[PDB]
Symmetry: C3
Subunit: 245 residues, 3 copies
């Protein structure tokens, strides 16, 4: 079976280095690439670097991600700035898109005395985590194995939102276009409530209900947007707390 995979991560996380290591001379300027694993023929897409789906390169990556084109994503993460990198990781995982986290720059992490508990991160993200040193090629045989074994991400609980935030997000979600997966509709709901403007273009006509939703939320919490951001940071921090000491 043929597969389409997008490389997604922060700028300077090692995406191109990984792209070259996997494809080499089998590349075309979007930048596409071809390689073959044991079971699959792969098309690899070098998406432009981004910190958050929320900025000319940012919009290119975002629309592609939401389209549902690629079967699987290789989320390239810099191990030496784990916290900052995990914001994008969490977005992809909250969106329910099949993910493999490629832990890159482990040699820099090690030099800076940063140790990461791989399995513990995997347990909390709910997807495979593969250590990598892309410049030396170390870890490639493991990443290919992960692709062959790729199942759906564990439906593990990522962000623990206040219950009224979930109620209002699902209320907004049930009104967005039918062709969008519920998991993506709920996330878009959250985005809108937080103040993400660009997020409205994908929410169809649900934006009309936004201002009244926040009015309702202001009766049960001090600042709805603050509570969203709080819950998200708590998720990132709790991961780093257990995973990286």
């Amino acid at each position: 079976k043929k597969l389409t995979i997008g490389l997604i991560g922060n700028p300077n996380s090692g995406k191109t280095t990984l792209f070259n290591q996997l494809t080499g001379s089998r590349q075309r300027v979007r930048k596409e690439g071809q390689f073959s694993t044991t079971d699959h023929q792969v098309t690899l897409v070098d998406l432009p670097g981004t910190y958050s789906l929320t900025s000319l390169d940012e919009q290119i990556a975002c629309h592609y991600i939401l389209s549902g084109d690629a079967d699987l994503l290789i989320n390239v993460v810099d191990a030496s700035n784990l916290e900052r990198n995990l914001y994008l990781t969490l977005q992809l995982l909250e969106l329910g898109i099949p993910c493999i986290v490629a832990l890159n720059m482990l040699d820099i992490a090690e030099k800076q005395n940063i140790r990461i508990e791989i399995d513990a991160l995997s347990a909390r993200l709910g997807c495979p985590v593969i250590p990598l040193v892309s410049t030396r090629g170390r870890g490639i045989e493991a990443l290919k194995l992960a692709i062959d074994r790729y199942k759906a991400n564990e439906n593990v609980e990522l962000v623990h939102y206040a219950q009224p935030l979930l109620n209002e997000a699902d209320s907004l979600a049930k009104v967005m276009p039918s062709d969008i997966p519920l998991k993506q509709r709920r996330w878009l709901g959250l985005q809108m409530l937080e103040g993400d403007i660009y997020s409205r273009a994908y929410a169809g006509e649900a934006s009309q209900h936004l201002d009244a939703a926040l009015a309702r939320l202001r009766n049960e919490m001090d600042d709805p947007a603050l509570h969203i951001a709080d819950a998200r940071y708590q998720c990132i921090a709790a991961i780093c707390d257990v995973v990286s000491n």
Copy 2:
């Protein structure tokens, strides 16, 4: 929703420090405090330091734990003396009280190059293990999340006792007051065969069988109390080697 959490740990593990970090000035003096999480309003109780549940401080904590006042416990554990601190941990988990182990003193354990594999510990304990990192509020952050996600401890076997010890503590448990849960009744029977005074008071009519129970045990094994302590030390040393 109101939750009541008790802080239990060895002397000098950092209970009050964590108590003060969680509650701030929302505290009165026993020392009780107040702090909120995403889903709950939490009442935190700072219990006295004790090495075991087996002076007054041993009874104060132990009587509190068995009273069922607390919905769950935060077990503050010194990371720089893991083996010493885990005896209490093993006891709470044998009791079946919902526990969250909080690893404190990360700085000291760093000084003497101690590394602990957190998830490996969690798996063998059956409860979450939360490091108390102070940078960027990571510890408190993770602790609060664990409180909102608290459930019953995982039913993983902890200590491996010899069969006659299990059979004997089991029969004693079948005799104790029916207003106490079974898992607690089994643990009480285990403590009695070791020779605990505080247990026999809780045990009631079970203490009438103790002499018969010990005698019956004395045929197969020479010393039951030692065998209980040894199996507990075995389990603790076994955990420490796989985990650090």
Copy 3:
């Protein structure tokens, strides 16, 4: 209950050293020993070092005297040691991996996530350090808690290789379990010399099998070899350094 446990591993792993501490003896570093765990009286069989499947330890395994094995593995040379580890687990022999020589690995500065290895192997992994006796408590406890290995997929072979190994196994002797038969048919396609002794009826299908594979993959024996290398190197990169 009585149990027979065999000590298997590479040459110079601490295999005989572990035999000395578990039993209560001292030997120059096949001998039998005796020790009692909490629930069992255990007969411990020390075997000579072997990298693969030297002929001394080879027979003791593929016979059926032992109920469980203690696979002694050097932590300083994990990648080298795991080839045998993988063999025992692909055969589905109940075993407890005993990581030894951790003081040497720590001196060379190598860190291992023990539970991440254990999850991938599907069996208990116990850190030791024999000379400075440490993991003896955790090992005895692992024996008492013995059970079947986890049905986790180890090596990822190409689908056509699996089809061939399957069809060979279906005609193989009935007395041997499926997991042992599937491994043998897969050793035949790689070209294992001392395999036809157990193949029985599978030899009259071996010639046609190879030709059916070579029509759709350019080296069946190397793909078997490559897949095993990939599996070991994947495990090592995710777990160590």
